[PDB]
């Protein structure tokens, strides 16, 4: 869809027997990262990770650096509080993750806001879709919920998500127009790997596409085959494009019985293709 | 731009 999203991802990892936790933040527009912050650096600062964000003046970088530093010390507070809620000891390392941001439509208007938290990898507490209420995972999360409700944090978050989030996302989308409004279709092709004197592997490749969302399907005689198929996770090529492939094991001949189907944005119509041998 | 908040849990 012609929609867009912006997302920040915070990871705080406590360090027992030592000092401040490690705090890292990254920001994405859709599947394109554009900023980062790492408390471990010598003098930590928000840093650009995309061309179209370097245009921002130093007020931007100073403000965001200060935001990340304050968040890091606060996350330290949150980590020792949560350790208290669960009666865990001082010896272990623990992780607090935050992810938040906004999905907007082609019109630039807001479709959905998000702000949720995980503790040691598990859903801890999340702002509901109405941007006015919370869903807690357990009773500890309800301690946190009473704190967030008393401080009316949901209204602050709704202000940010309906305000700065969408406005700055529209600014980013306009400034990185070429790189963010693009949809690179996948360059696609099928390969053949004989594993026996009758068995073989039929692998369908999608390379160089953007964004990461894609669906590959194997169809035996034009009929959904999902049996002894291998489907690897979508993976980054490192040049801001993505790669994926799916494989099916196939007996003797009858390779032409099988078809791979590729659904992706940048494609005008879905793609059907078979092993074209030589 | 990140949220100009330091929420605590």
């Amino acid at each position: 869809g012609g929609s867009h999203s912006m997302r920040y991802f915070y990871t705080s990892v406590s360090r027992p027997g030592r000092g401040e936790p490690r705090f890292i933040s990254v920001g994405y527009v859709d599947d394109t990262q554009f900023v980062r912050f790492d408390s471990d650096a010598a003098s930590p600062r928000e840093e650009p990770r995309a061309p179209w964000i370097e245009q921002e003046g130093p007020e931007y970088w100073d403000r965001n650096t200060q935001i990340y530093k304050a968040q890091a010390q606060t996350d330290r507070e949150s980590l020792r509080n949560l350790r208290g809620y669960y009666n865990q000891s001082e010896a272990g390392s623990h992780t607090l993750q935050s992810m938040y941001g906004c999905d907007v439509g082609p019109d630039g208007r807001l479709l959905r806001g998000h702000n949720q938290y995980a503790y040691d990898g598990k859903d801890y507490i999340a702002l509901n879709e109405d941007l006015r209420s919370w869903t807690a995972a357990d009773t500890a999360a309800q301690i946190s919920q009473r704190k967030l409700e008393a401080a009316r944090v949901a209204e602050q978050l709704r202000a940010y998500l309906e305000g700065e989030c969408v406005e700055w996302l529209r600014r980013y989308l306009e400034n990185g127009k070429d790189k963010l409004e693009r949809a690179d279709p996948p360059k696609t092709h099928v390969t053949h790997h004989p594993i026996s004197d009758h068995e073989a592997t039929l692998r369908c490749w999608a390379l160089g596409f953007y964004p990461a969302e894609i669906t590959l399907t194997w169809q035996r005689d034009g009929e959904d085959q999902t049996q002894d198929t291998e489907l690897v996770e979508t993976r980054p090529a490192g040049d801001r494009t993505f790669q994926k492939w799916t494989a099916v094991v196939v007996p003797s001949g009858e390779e032409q019985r099988y078809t791979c189907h590729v659904q992706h944005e940048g494609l005008p119509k879905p793609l059907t293709l078979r092993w074209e041998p030589s | 731009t990140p949220q100009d908040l330091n929420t605590m849990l």
Partner: T-cell receptor
Amino acid sequence: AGVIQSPRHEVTEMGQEVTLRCKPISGHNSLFWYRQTMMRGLELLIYFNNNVPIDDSGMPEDRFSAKMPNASFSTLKIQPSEPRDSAVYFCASSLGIDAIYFGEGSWLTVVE
Amino acid sequence: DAKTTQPPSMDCAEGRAANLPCNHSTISGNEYVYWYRQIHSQGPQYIIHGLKNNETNEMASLIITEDRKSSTLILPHATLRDTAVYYCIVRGLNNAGNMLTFGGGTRLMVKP
């Protein structure tokens, strides 16, 4: 109770260390130190939120130090006091985005 | 930063309504209008605040225009205890704007 501040009055010779203490309203997570003089009226010295110093741009560049060791106690200290430090120092707190409430202040006259 | 402007002084007759104007033409959508007052050698005292809708409480009523660019604090029946300096303050919903920045205010004198 409201914001608790002490000392309410302090008359002390220059060159001493001055310590002003504040207890925010129970459960409030934000705390502000303000200075009030004739020349400039009320001026923000420092703003803490959830025990973390957010804005200390108003703090004098020397001799002034503000701390918040726990959610229910904060100090403003003036390392060697000087007569120009004379003013009323107000502590305020708030619970999230509810209203900010002010203490009764510490009236400091640093005397030559 | 201060975004409000007020008349430096204003007089009101005891038992009459006091209409205290305030301009804030650059106010943002995530910014509330607060009104505080300070007597003499006392800490500022919260009066009232609002976003878009007009608001009332035991002390005052607050009228915010449709375009939000100005507002009026209304003391419906001034008493002698209402003589004070009245501050109109914008307060935003994030850390850049969560503190109060005090301007000149309006010195209101209630005439018996």
